[PDB]
Amino acid sequence: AFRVLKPWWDVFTDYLSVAMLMIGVFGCTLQVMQDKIICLPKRVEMKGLKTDLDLQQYSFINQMCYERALHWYAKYFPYLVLIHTLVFMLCSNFWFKFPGSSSKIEHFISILGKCFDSPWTTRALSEQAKALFEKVKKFRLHVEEGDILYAMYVRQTVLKVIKFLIIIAYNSALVSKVQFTVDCNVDIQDMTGYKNFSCNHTMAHLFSKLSFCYLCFVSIYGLTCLYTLYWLFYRSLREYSFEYVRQETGIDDIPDVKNDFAFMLHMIDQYDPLYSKRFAVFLSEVSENKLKQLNLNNEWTPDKLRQKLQTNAHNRLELPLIMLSGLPDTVFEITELQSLKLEIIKNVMIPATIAQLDNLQELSLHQCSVKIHSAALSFLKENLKVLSVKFDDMRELPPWMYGLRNLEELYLVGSLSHRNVTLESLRDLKSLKILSIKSNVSKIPQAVVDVSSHLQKMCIHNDGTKLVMLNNLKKMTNLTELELVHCDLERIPHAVFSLLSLQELDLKENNLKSIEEIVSFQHLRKLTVLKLWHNSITYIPEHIKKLTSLERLSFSHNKIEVLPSHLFLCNKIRYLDLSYNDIRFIPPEIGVLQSLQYFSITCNKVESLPDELYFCKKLKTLKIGKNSLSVLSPKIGNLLFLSYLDVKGNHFEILPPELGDCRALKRARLVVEDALFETLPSDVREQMKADA
Amino acid sequence: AFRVLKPWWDVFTDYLSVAMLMIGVFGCTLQVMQDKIICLPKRVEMKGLKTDLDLQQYSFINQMCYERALHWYAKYFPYLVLIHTLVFMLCSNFWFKFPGSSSKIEHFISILGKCFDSPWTTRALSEQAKALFEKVKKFRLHVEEGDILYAMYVRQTVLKVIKFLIIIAYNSALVSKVQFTVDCNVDIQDMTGYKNFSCNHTMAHLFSKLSFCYLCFVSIYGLTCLYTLYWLFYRSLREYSFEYVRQETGIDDIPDVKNDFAFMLHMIDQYDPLYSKRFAVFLSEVSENKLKQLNLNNEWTPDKLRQKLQTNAHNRLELPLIMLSGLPDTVFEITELQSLKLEIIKNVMIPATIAQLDNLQELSLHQCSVKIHSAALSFLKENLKVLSVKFDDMRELPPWMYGLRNLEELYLVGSLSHRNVTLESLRDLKSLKILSIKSNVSKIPQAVVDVSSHLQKMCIHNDGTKLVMLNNLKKMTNLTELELVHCDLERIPHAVFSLLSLQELDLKENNLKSIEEIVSFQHLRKLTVLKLWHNSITYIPEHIKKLTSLERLSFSHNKIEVLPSHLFLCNKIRYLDLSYNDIRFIPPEIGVLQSLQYFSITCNKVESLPDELYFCKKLKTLKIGKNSLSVLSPKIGNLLFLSYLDVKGNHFEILPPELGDCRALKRARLVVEDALFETLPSDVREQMKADA
């Protein structure tokens, strides 16, 4: 604190100053004690020379000739040395005592003491100091733009030099002024009768030697100061470069430091370089990252991870990551999970340690600007089969996923056209079969055709953008199944008819009304499932009877009001969705659809129940919903395989006990009004709720 | 409490004062040791000049001539210097030696240091400081009333300067007064025989030099003090404005400080700008809010939230929040719950993080001034289907909810008419299907018409204000379920007949007496449920028998005493509340009300039971209450499906065992006295209580 700043020569000057003050005080005490110029009158077998002067006269003569004859240097030397040594001490400590420098120095000594103290420094050179990191960077921001400390030190030393020079320059000449004997021609007569006096100065000889001795001190002092001056103008401390500790521990960080930092680090080094090396760590950003990783690993343990382990949508062991900044290493201790979820973790490097986690084929990236390792990338291209990616500003999407070959299913969340898709080529995705698109691109990009060679199912669910050109869609030769949800086509495009291998088609939220292209649909004989959700279809073309291959029909939220009889000409269908439609009556041909196993007319206008409905026993799910039926035909007891029933929201009053014959149907599958359910027999409800 | 108050010039003045003290004390010691006058009689080959004076006479001459001839300043210079230096010390330290100012400055330094050490300062600039914020604001309040510190400091500096002029003024004019030699004509004749004496005191010469040196010191001192004066009249220390820190850290608060606090800031800045910079962060209100939020996040954990996670009245997962400063962010981690209960939480803003909580269809806002994020607003507009708001002064109501379209059920607590109701339009509310109102609307606002297009259910339960106008009610054509609770109508309004789509009707607490408008009610052929709670209805118009669609009837707390036969003609009714009335005898035609499932005559004067009552086996609820009955007809056993019985508070003695036949009626549904219950057979009571 009070020591680590002064190099050897500063303590040298302090010691010389203390010794100099000792010399000066010695001289002062001697002078006060015995300084007695002794005087006699001068002008004149032998006898004495009795001058008959009483003691008072002798003291008076001594005093007078002291003031007159003795040259001022011999009189004033000790106080002079006192002043000079006092000024030297003041100017030595002025660097600390001045507040402008004192603030910076106190800040620096505090921060550097704590930095040298931290054991994480030693660990890195081979837990809470990450705050000291921020303190260090704040401090260097505070003082690097100074250099006033360098100015203060240079001024201090240069004034010391000028003082030493003036001391030698005058004192060398003035030393020879002292004389042991001395003369004085004073007009003391008329009070003693004598005019010409001789005297001897007792201290003279002593002072002479003292001066000489004192002079030696000054000489040494000056040389010391000069060296400092040389050391302050030969190494140019305005800039410092580590270039050794950087090479010592082989970390290319810690580039350089600015002026005041350079100077003060130089000072500390000239005290001891060990403190400089132990300080070198905290400027390293690599050290910062490593300390962050250690701290999070201290916080992140495989226990906590396996606590959060769960199953994804695709029944896979997955660890959610909702809000982080890096990858805890403890996850690399968990090779069992085969899915991984990451939400909004930028600035992430994927290590090769994922190679330990081979048992994984699914990954999730929700707006995470993340890059990979080379071995990590190879591990992805050789192991992963499924990937879900959410992105917002294209920054979270790095290109390397376009190289993953063994991936089989892909999910995308984010707009590309912002209307051409800024989509890279989907060619290296050699094993992809499933593609999920969540964007607003008006056109299907050519990159889709880059994967069409092995693409089996591709799903686009835009936000309402129209698929303006469907030319690339016609290239989906390998496309086994096709979905066009909310593509705003409003019609049946010709591209769909280009895919004979198509099995299941959805046009949800496309608001189709004129669907007379069913003729082209009989061109596609693999069409087993057709879905027309939320479409303005108020009428059903007769060409639907020509699609024998159909197995499932979706027409929820459609303006059909009366279903034509030709609808029933395709008995192969097993699933029938007609809910939220204007349907008011069921034609009896509902009987021929024996293979039907599902039905839904929730929130429709159906008021009557044809009895042929009770002939398709394969119907296991019935959803009347909020319709206008008022009586339930007992023929419901004929449909034993009906497992689900949704008549709630209708005008029934009493439920016939024929519901007791429905073994597949229970209260779980029975959606009825509580009052209507109460009308059922006690035995029926006991058998229906449980085993009675 | 000692260092940072002194800028550089104060330290310089302190050192000059110290060194001046050194000069003075050195002079004092020398004067003690050496200051002797030496005197000789003046007026008179060469010989001695014997004066034949014994030592006593010489000493007496010394005393006399020293007292007379030697000028006082030469005699007292060191003591004068000591006095002036000491006064300088005292007038320098009078700042802190005054207790009133001492408390202020000491507290200032304590809190400033503490603020400097606070790591939360660093975090903000990037735990327990929450307490320190209050101390900070209390202190700034306590000190921004002063400026006595600045005035006293100005007084100190002017005192120092004027004393400096005084010192120079007379020392310059008296320095020449000291003289080595000196003369004295003293009339000591007849006592030592001489009159003219010459003397010299040894110190004179030295003192000259000393004075010169001393002058220089004081001169420099004055110069430094003079600078302070310039520094006290050029910066206008009455005000401090950061405007750089306010720009550096980008925090627009910390406006300014008053003269006293501004002056202290100027001092600290002169010591170091960084102290003031770091201290400014604790004046930020935004920083304080962030600290409060962080602290409540520290106090709250998702486990604590899930501790009170429960079901609401409308069976939804919800967490109570009764009193808070904001949202503990942990709530954003819990997405399963679809409703949140927040009460009396002002200045809350819901971020985009609500989008994490997609499983959401209900909400609660009890007098909470809450703003929203943009993504938050979209999430409310798209996800919510039910919502509860309590507001008091329309400020807790956040207007943006008038823009939510997908909401379907909304309940409001808070007056509107206040009787002009400043209710905003219910137009952007597109998907609403259910509405509850708790206001003071004497008028149905036009805003309801903007939701009447899509309206399905609306319930107004004003605090009793008469809904005088109801033309907007006539615009509720699409309305299906209507309730008018405590609307103080006292009569059947014509607006009700304007709503043919109406299914359920309520006029509770409207205190209707004359209800002869039932004729227009059979205009409403969709009228399923009709309620007449707490009405003054003396009797029953026959037009009620003309309501074909009657299903449920309420006559709670009415002045009805005898009921007519035509009332029973609407056998379609299943619910019949007649309690708290003057009923005494039930006409036997109660039998035709076979479809009736409910009955209540509690707190009436009924004295006999027609047996045709027991014909309506559909009657499952029976609330006789406290009436004037004495015996029970065994035909109650005919009511096998009777599930409830309230006979408590009557005059029975022994009940028929036919109660054992009623399978739906058990001991729990049998509201009876215990002594009377004992009169029943043990088998019946065992069967009712348990399965024996």
Side-chain angles (χ1 to χ4, degrees), chain A residues 1-416 419 423-668 670-690 692, chain B residues 1-416 419 423-668 670-690 692:
Chain A
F2 30 89
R3 156 195 76 260
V4 284
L5 298 320
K6 314 176 183 176
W8 52 274
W9 70 82
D10 186 273
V11 196
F12 199 18
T13 57
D14 158 271
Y15 280 158
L16 289 207
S17 307
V18 171
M20 261 172 189
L21 165 158
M22 291 325 317
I23 275 188
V25 62
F26 196 70
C28 268
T29 81
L30 287 197
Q31 184 143 348
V32 174
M33 196 107 93
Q34 305 305 322
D35 84 308
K36 291 189 293 306
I37 172 176
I38 295 190
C39 291
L40 294 181
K42 196 248 192 176
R43 188 90 84 259
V44 200
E45 182 266 354
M46 71 305 288
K47 317 157 192 171
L49 191 69
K50 45 167 43 195
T51 44
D52 49 275
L53 310 187
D54 40 357
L55 258 46
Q56 185 96 293
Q57 276 165 1
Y58 274 144
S59 302
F60 182 73
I61 287 166
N62 286 333
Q63 203 144 300
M64 172 79 39
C65 189
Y66 191 15
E67 186 269 358
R68 302 279 142 166
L70 230 55
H71 173 278
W72 61 279
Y73 174 46
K75 285 186 293 180
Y76 290 155
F77 167 97
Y79 331 116
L80 199 173
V81 153
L82 257 63
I83 299 320
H84 261 283
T85 296
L86 165 145
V87 168
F88 263 134
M89 298 225 308
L90 154 70
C91 82
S92 182
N93 284 122
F94 152 81
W95 176 39
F96 291 167
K97 296 315 181 181
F98 190 98
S101 81
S102 165
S103 59
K104 318 297 198 308
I105 287 322
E106 208 279 336
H107 198 179
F108 179 95
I109 185 50
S110 49
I111 175 180
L112 184 132
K114 317 323 299 169
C115 167
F116 155 98
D117 183 78
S118 155
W120 193 91
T121 69
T122 298
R123 182 177 290 187
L125 291 176
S126 318
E127 189 172 333
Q128 322 303 327
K130 82 181 196 178
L132 215 166
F133 263 137
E134 160 52 17
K135 206 167 304 301
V136 160
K137 62 201 55 183
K138 169 259 309 176
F139 166 87
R140 61 97 61 92
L141 153 56
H142 173 43
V143 288
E144 275 157 349
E145 309 77 344
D147 92 339
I148 76 90
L149 274 293
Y150 170 94
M152 301 275 268
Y153 207 84
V154 156
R155 291 193 173 281
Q156 161 151 338
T157 58
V158 77
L159 73 84
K160 284 190 186 183
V161 153
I162 201 71
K163 273 193 46 188
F164 146 85
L165 283 209
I166 205 62
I167 286 283
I168 164 175
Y170 88 107
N171 211 262
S172 191
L174 227 60
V175 152
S176 63
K177 222 68 179 176
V178 300
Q179 287 280 35
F180 185 81
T181 82
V182 71
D183 197 313
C184 40
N185 304 26
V186 186
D187 208 355
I188 289 279
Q189 202 183 345
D190 190 24
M191 330 169 258
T192 72
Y194 283 121
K195 173 256 171 186
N196 255 346
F197 298 63
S198 286
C199 309
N200 83 313
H201 177 18
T202 84
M203 321 286 258
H205 192 96
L206 182 143
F207 272 3
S208 173
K209 289 319 170 181
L210 255 189
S211 277
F212 201 87
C213 157
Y214 154 90
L215 191 43
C216 275
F217 277 6
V218 161
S219 178
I220 270 176
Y221 211 98
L223 261 296
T224 280
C225 274
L226 262 278
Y227 175 73
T228 303
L229 261 286
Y230 189 42
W231 181 69
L232 287 202
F233 288 87
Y234 188 46
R235 335 298 185 87
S236 192
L237 312 185
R238 276 192 190 176
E239 298 181 358
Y240 182 83
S241 282
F242 280 71
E243 300 300 322
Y244 154 75
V245 173
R246 171 190 58 75
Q247 305 187 194
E248 152 60 36
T249 47
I251 40 186
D252 300 337
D253 35 29
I254 310 129
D256 282 314
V257 298
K258 293 297 312 280
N259 276 39
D260 206 300
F261 216 79
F263 166 89
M264 203 169 318
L265 192 276
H266 276 295
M267 271 330 322
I268 287 309
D269 157 81
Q270 285 315 125
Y271 167 76
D272 156 30
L274 185 275
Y275 275 83
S276 71
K277 167 222 83 173
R278 275 179 174 271
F279 196 93
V281 55
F282 283 178
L283 172 56
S284 155
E285 67 292 348
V286 184
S287 66
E288 312 248 10
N289 308 312
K290 290 179 177 173
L291 186 38
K292 291 188 292 284
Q293 179 62 218
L294 169 64
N295 184 207
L296 63 84
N297 293 317
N298 290 14
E299 189 274 329
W300 281 125
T301 65
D303 162 68
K304 307 179 180 62
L305 319 172
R306 295 188 162 85
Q307 284 160 356
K308 306 187 51 54
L309 271 179
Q310 62 182 24
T311 169
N312 72 325
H314 321 76
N315 43 284
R316 264 206 185 91
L317 187 54
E318 190 172 40
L319 177 55
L321 293 177
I322 163 162
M323 257 332 306
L324 281 179
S325 317
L327 308 178
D329 312 327
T330 48
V331 308
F332 303 113
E333 322 178 27
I334 317 195
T335 191
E336 40 274 42
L337 89 172
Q338 79 296 21
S339 187
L340 189 31
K341 160 195 158 305
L342 295 90
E343 211 143 55
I344 321 174
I345 319 90
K346 311 296 184 295
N347 73 27
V348 162
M349 179 29 45
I350 299 178
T353 41
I354 60 134
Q356 314 153 359
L357 327 171
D358 183 64
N359 324 297
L360 179 133
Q361 299 177 357
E362 194 161 2
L363 176 68
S364 140
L365 294 321
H366 297 181
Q367 314 155 356
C368 307
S369 303
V370 177
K371 309 133 290 298
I372 50 89
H373 182 255
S374 305
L377 187 61
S378 313
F379 216 68
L380 329 168
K381 305 190 175 185
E382 78 207 25
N383 297 125
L384 188 94
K385 311 304 170 176
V386 195
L387 166 65
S388 305
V389 166
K390 304 192 177 182
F391 63 97
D392 296 354
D393 302 336
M394 187 31 251
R395 56 167 190 268
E396 327 87 337
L397 182 96
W400 44 257
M401 322 69 68
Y402 296 77
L404 322 172
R405 47 166 42 186
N406 290 162
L407 180 86
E408 312 158 351
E409 316 169 6
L410 188 49
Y411 303 79
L412 286 321
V413 172
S415 302
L416 281 171
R419 317 261 344 265
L423 178 55
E424 323 169 24
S425 179
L426 320 169
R427 153 49 44 232
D428 200 358
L429 326 173
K430 307 302 296 178
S431 173
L432 187 71
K433 320 143 187 178
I434 295 183
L435 171 57
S436 167
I437 304 172
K438 295 300 296 173
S439 301
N440 51 21
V441 198
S442 62
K443 61 102 185 182
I444 176 174
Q446 174 271 346
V448 194
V449 195
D450 303 358
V451 83
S452 60
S453 57
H454 32 269
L455 162 69
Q456 307 169 357
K457 180 173 190 51
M458 160 305 300
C459 322
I460 156 77
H461 329 291
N462 45 328
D463 49 1
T465 310
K466 173 172 180 53
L467 187 49
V468 287
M469 151 293 301
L470 313 101
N471 176 32
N472 303 337
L473 176 56
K474 319 170 184 179
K475 319 301 176 181
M476 291 325 88
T477 309
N478 297 82
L479 193 64
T480 60
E481 298 154 15
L482 166 63
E483 302 179 2
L484 304 179
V485 167
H486 206 19
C487 295
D488 207 358
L489 291 180
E490 306 290 324
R491 273 309 191 86
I492 316 191
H494 189 67
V496 180
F497 319 137
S498 312
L499 313 183
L500 292 90
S501 300
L502 170 55
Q503 313 154 1
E504 315 170 351
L505 169 55
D506 185 9
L507 297 176
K508 159 182 164 180
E509 292 176 359
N510 285 334
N511 206 47
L512 259 68
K513 181 182 303 180
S514 167
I515 51 171
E516 318 306 311
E517 297 88 341
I518 319 290
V519 278
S520 303
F521 281 163
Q522 80 207 98
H523 172 248
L524 319 176
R525 280 318 184 187
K526 302 307 164 302
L527 185 63
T528 67
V529 184
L530 72 176
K531 329 177 195 175
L532 285 178
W533 302 59
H534 329 301
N535 284 354
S536 311
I537 292 140
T538 190
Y539 148 83
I540 302 179
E542 197 192 3
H543 328 304
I544 199 167
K545 85 192 178 177
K546 309 167 175 54
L547 288 173
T548 309
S549 307
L550 291 184
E551 318 171 359
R552 306 172 49 85
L553 180 45
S554 322
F555 256 134
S556 64
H557 319 78
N558 283 254
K559 336 287 155 294
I560 179 66
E561 39 287 47
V562 172
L563 57 160
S565 179
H566 65 243
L567 221 33
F568 311 89
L569 298 192
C570 297
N571 43 332
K572 189 198 179 187
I573 300 181
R574 303 143 186 78
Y575 179 104
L576 186 38
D577 181 11
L578 304 171
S579 48
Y580 316 97
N581 300 341
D582 320 327
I583 292 303
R584 200 164 300 101
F585 309 103
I586 308 309
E589 294 87 346
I590 184 174
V592 57
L593 309 171
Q594 197 69 19
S595 78
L596 205 71
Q597 311 182 8
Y598 173 93
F599 195 66
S600 176
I601 37 172
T602 82
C603 310
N604 294 23
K605 307 192 58 182
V606 187
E607 329 200 359
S608 299
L609 294 176
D611 283 353
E612 304 80 4
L613 171 152
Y614 310 95
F615 298 165
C616 316
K617 299 190 182 308
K618 312 186 214 167
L619 273 165
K620 315 194 61 181
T621 298
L622 181 49
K623 311 177 47 190
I624 303 313
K626 324 173 196 59
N627 299 347
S628 172
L629 316 175
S630 304
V631 68
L632 162 57
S633 166
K635 292 194 178 185
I636 174 64
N638 317 341
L639 308 178
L640 310 181
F641 313 98
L642 188 71
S643 46
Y644 177 77
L645 187 59
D646 173 29
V647 304
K648 205 164 182 117
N650 289 254
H651 308 74
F652 305 110
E653 39 287 46
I654 272 296
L655 302 185
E658 290 276 326
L659 312 185
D661 325 309
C662 301
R663 330 138 309 175
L665 186 68
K666 292 188 306 175
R667 228 309 178 191
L670 184 74
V671 186
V672 293
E673 317 285 347
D674 282 339
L676 278 45
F677 175 77
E678 203 172 13
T679 65
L680 276 171
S682 177
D683 310 326
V684 172
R685 64 204 305 173
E686 284 163 6
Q687 181 184 357
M688 192 224 288
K689 294 177 301 181
Chain B
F2 328 95
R3 176 157 65 254
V4 294
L5 273 274
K6 319 179 179 176
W8 63 267
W9 66 74
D10 187 284
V11 162
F12 204 76
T13 48
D14 187 67
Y15 270 171
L16 291 203
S17 296
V18 152
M20 272 163 28
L21 164 39
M22 222 51 92
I23 271 178
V25 61
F26 166 87
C28 288
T29 88
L30 283 207
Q31 193 212 49
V32 162
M33 271 206 85
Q34 295 321 122
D35 183 85
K36 316 161 298 305
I37 190 61
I38 278 184
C39 284
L40 281 189
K42 217 283 182 182
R43 185 82 80 261
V44 172
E45 185 212 1
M46 81 305 288
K47 320 169 187 177
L49 206 71
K50 57 190 323 298
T51 57
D52 47 283
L53 303 188
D54 43 0
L55 283 153
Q56 174 94 9
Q57 285 167 349
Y58 272 130
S59 277
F60 180 49
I61 285 161
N62 284 343
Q63 290 275 328
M64 184 87 17
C65 181
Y66 169 47
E67 226 75 45
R68 302 278 147 137
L70 222 59
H71 182 276
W72 62 270
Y73 169 51
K75 304 192 299 189
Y76 299 145
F77 169 93
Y79 297 166
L80 191 150
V81 160
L82 257 299
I83 283 173
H84 279 277
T85 278
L86 181 143
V87 174
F88 267 129
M89 301 315 168
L90 231 47
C91 85
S92 165
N93 288 345
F94 195 62
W95 190 353
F96 325 139
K97 290 312 180 175
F98 166 59
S101 61
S102 159
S103 52
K104 323 294 173 303
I105 52 145
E106 168 264 351
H107 198 182
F108 181 98
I109 286 318
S110 58
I111 62 197
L112 161 44
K114 292 153 62 177
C115 171
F116 176 73
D117 323 287
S118 155
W120 190 92
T121 63
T122 317
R123 189 181 304 194
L125 295 160
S126 309
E127 194 189 7
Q128 317 303 332
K130 198 162 177 171
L132 322 180
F133 258 89
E134 335 296 334
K135 180 174 305 304
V136 162
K137 50 186 51 189
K138 174 215 313 161
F139 185 89
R140 60 91 47 102
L141 289 165
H142 168 40
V143 180
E144 279 158 336
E145 52 218 39
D147 87 338
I148 53 101
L149 273 206
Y150 153 92
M152 182 226 78
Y153 187 73
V154 171
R155 294 178 189 278
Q156 279 214 347
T157 72
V158 57
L159 173 64
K160 262 168 195 174
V161 154
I162 180 184
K163 219 180 55 165
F164 145 77
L165 293 323
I166 285 181
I167 272 296
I168 286 306
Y170 73 55
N171 269 267
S172 59
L174 293 191
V175 74
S176 74
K177 225 43 176 183
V178 306
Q179 278 290 353
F180 183 86
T181 75
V182 66
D183 202 317
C184 48
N185 313 44
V186 186
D187 187 18
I188 330 171
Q189 200 162 0
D190 292 25
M191 271 178 9
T192 173
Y194 291 101
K195 181 255 177 189
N196 259 315
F197 294 68
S198 154
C199 305
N200 34 24
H201 66 131
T202 181
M203 301 275 248
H205 217 280
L206 175 133
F207 273 3
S208 282
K209 329 280 189 169
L210 249 191
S211 298
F212 203 112
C213 263
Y214 172 85
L215 279 206
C216 295
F217 263 28
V218 162
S219 173
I220 290 189
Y221 200 83
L223 273 200
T224 281
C225 266
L226 268 206
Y227 172 74
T228 288
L229 270 283
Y230 174 40
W231 189 83
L232 284 197
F233 287 80
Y234 185 50
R235 306 329 158 115
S236 167
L237 305 194
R238 296 169 176 173
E239 284 163 346
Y240 184 95
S241 286
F242 309 79
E243 312 322 298
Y244 168 75
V245 180
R246 189 197 41 71
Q247 294 180 1
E248 164 52 46
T249 45
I251 45 189
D252 307 358
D253 46 345
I254 316 81
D256 273 334
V257 291
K258 190 263 205 171
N259 305 7
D260 211 321
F261 218 75
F263 157 82
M264 312 294 311
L265 277 194
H266 287 301
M267 291 325 188
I268 281 294
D269 170 316
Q270 289 300 328
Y271 182 99
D272 158 69
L274 180 281
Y275 265 6
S276 75
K277 157 89 72 64
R278 199 194 298 306
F279 181 79
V281 86
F282 273 5
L283 267 275
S284 156
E285 192 39 61
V286 183
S287 69
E288 184 178 348
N289 304 331
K290 296 185 180 182
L291 183 41
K292 292 188 294 284
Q293 169 59 218
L294 178 67
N295 204 318
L296 58 62
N297 300 138
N298 290 16
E299 178 251 325
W300 288 116
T301 56
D303 75 60
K304 294 182 192 62
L305 323 172
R306 291 184 167 86
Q307 284 159 22
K308 302 149 40 59
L309 258 189
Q310 58 183 17
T311 206
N312 67 324
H314 320 78
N315 321 339
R316 258 205 184 91
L317 189 55
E318 189 177 42
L319 162 68
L321 314 172
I322 168 66
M323 253 326 318
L324 274 186
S325 318
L327 314 173
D329 314 313
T330 54
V331 316
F332 294 115
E333 321 170 13
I334 314 184
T335 82
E336 52 271 38
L337 91 171
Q338 319 161 8
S339 194
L340 190 31
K341 160 194 159 304
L342 307 94
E343 311 176 319
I344 323 174
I345 324 175
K346 314 295 175 286
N347 59 274
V348 199
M349 178 315 300
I350 177 65
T353 47
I354 167 179
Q356 303 148 358
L357 271 54
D358 189 55
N359 177 29
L360 157 75
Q361 295 196 9
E362 200 155 9
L363 230 3
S364 146
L365 316 202
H366 296 184
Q367 325 161 351
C368 296
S369 297
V370 177
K371 332 302 158 294
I372 64 184
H373 186 251
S374 43
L377 182 45
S378 306
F379 219 68
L380 330 171
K381 289 182 165 182
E382 75 210 22
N383 292 113
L384 206 69
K385 317 298 164 179
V386 194
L387 191 173
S388 317
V389 164
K390 293 189 183 171
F391 71 102
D392 301 353
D393 183 75
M394 172 36 48
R395 174 56 267 152
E396 326 87 354
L397 170 139
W400 46 257
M401 25 52 60
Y402 292 88
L404 324 172
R405 304 158 311 299
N406 288 124
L407 175 33
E408 304 152 0
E409 314 186 10
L410 175 33
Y411 332 105
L412 298 321
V413 172
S415 297
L416 297 177
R419 303 179 51 76
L423 169 65
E424 322 177 17
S425 174
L426 323 173
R427 158 56 46 226
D428 322 316
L429 321 175
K430 311 307 294 176
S431 176
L432 272 303
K433 303 157 188 172
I434 291 183
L435 163 65
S436 174
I437 307 172
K438 296 302 294 173
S439 304
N440 60 356
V441 293
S442 52
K443 57 101 178 177
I444 170 176
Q446 175 270 348
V448 199
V449 187
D450 317 306
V451 76
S452 64
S453 55
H454 31 289
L455 183 55
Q456 300 175 11
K457 175 142 199 46
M458 177 314 304
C459 283
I460 159 70
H461 312 337
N462 63 348
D463 44 358
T465 88
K466 194 172 186 60
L467 197 61
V468 287
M469 61 65 58
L470 319 90
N471 57 46
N472 298 331
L473 177 56
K474 316 177 180 183
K475 322 303 172 188
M476 314 284 130
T477 307
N478 310 93
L479 178 57
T480 53
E481 303 93 29
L482 158 67
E483 304 154 13
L484 298 184
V485 166
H486 197 3
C487 294
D488 203 6
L489 305 179
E490 308 293 323
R491 270 308 196 95
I492 304 188
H494 193 75
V496 168
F497 329 130
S498 313
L499 315 183
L500 186 47
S501 306
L502 183 50
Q503 311 164 4
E504 308 174 353
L505 214 167
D506 190 10
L507 292 181
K508 160 172 172 173
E509 290 169 344
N510 300 349
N511 326 297
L512 261 64
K513 188 185 309 175
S514 178
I515 53 174
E516 314 294 326
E517 299 86 351
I518 315 298
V519 301
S520 306
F521 275 169
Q522 54 248 18
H523 144 63
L524 309 172
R525 281 313 180 192
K526 291 304 154 297
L527 180 55
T528 63
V529 188
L530 186 269
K531 321 169 195 173
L532 290 172
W533 298 65
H534 325 115
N535 286 352
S536 310
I537 293 150
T538 166
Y539 281 125
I540 305 180
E542 192 139 4
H543 326 306
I544 188 165
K545 90 181 183 181
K546 313 173 181 54
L547 313 190
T548 309
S549 309
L550 272 183
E551 306 178 358
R552 304 169 51 82
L553 178 56
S554 68
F555 262 115
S556 61
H557 311 67
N558 283 252
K559 334 286 151 292
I560 165 62
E561 288 66 10
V562 183
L563 60 157
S565 171
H566 61 244
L567 189 269
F568 315 103
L569 291 196
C570 277
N571 49 330
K572 190 195 170 181
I573 310 170
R574 305 157 186 76
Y575 183 103
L576 186 51
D577 187 12
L578 306 174
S579 54
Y580 300 88
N581 305 331
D582 314 328
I583 311 302
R584 219 145 303 101
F585 310 102
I586 302 309
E589 300 86 321
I590 184 174
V592 57
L593 295 171
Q594 195 70 18
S595 81
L596 209 67
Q597 310 172 2
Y598 170 92
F599 194 64
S600 182
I601 36 165
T602 86
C603 307
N604 299 343
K605 322 168 55 196
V606 184
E607 311 166 2
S608 296
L609 301 182
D611 276 3
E612 305 77 6
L613 155 72
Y614 312 94
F615 294 174
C616 324
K617 299 178 179 301
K618 290 196 177 180
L619 275 167
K620 315 198 62 163
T621 313
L622 196 52
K623 318 178 47 185
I624 313 303
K626 315 173 200 59
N627 304 326
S628 167
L629 291 171
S630 305
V631 75
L632 161 61
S633 171
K635 280 204 184 174
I636 175 150
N638 311 349
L639 295 167
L640 302 175
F641 327 125
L642 180 62
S643 61
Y644 180 68
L645 189 54
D646 174 27
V647 317
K648 200 94 173 163
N650 296 265
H651 329 83
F652 296 80
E653 283 79 33
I654 298 107
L655 294 319
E658 305 299 320
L659 319 172
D661 308 7
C662 314
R663 295 316 312 124
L665 188 51
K666 291 172 299 181
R667 210 279 157 193
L670 170 90
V671 183
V672 287
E673 333 281 349
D674 302 330
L676 297 200
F677 180 85
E678 191 176 13
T679 67
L680 272 185
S682 179
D683 303 323
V684 169
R685 65 197 302 180
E686 282 172 8
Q687 185 184 9
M688 275 199 168
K689 291 184 304 176

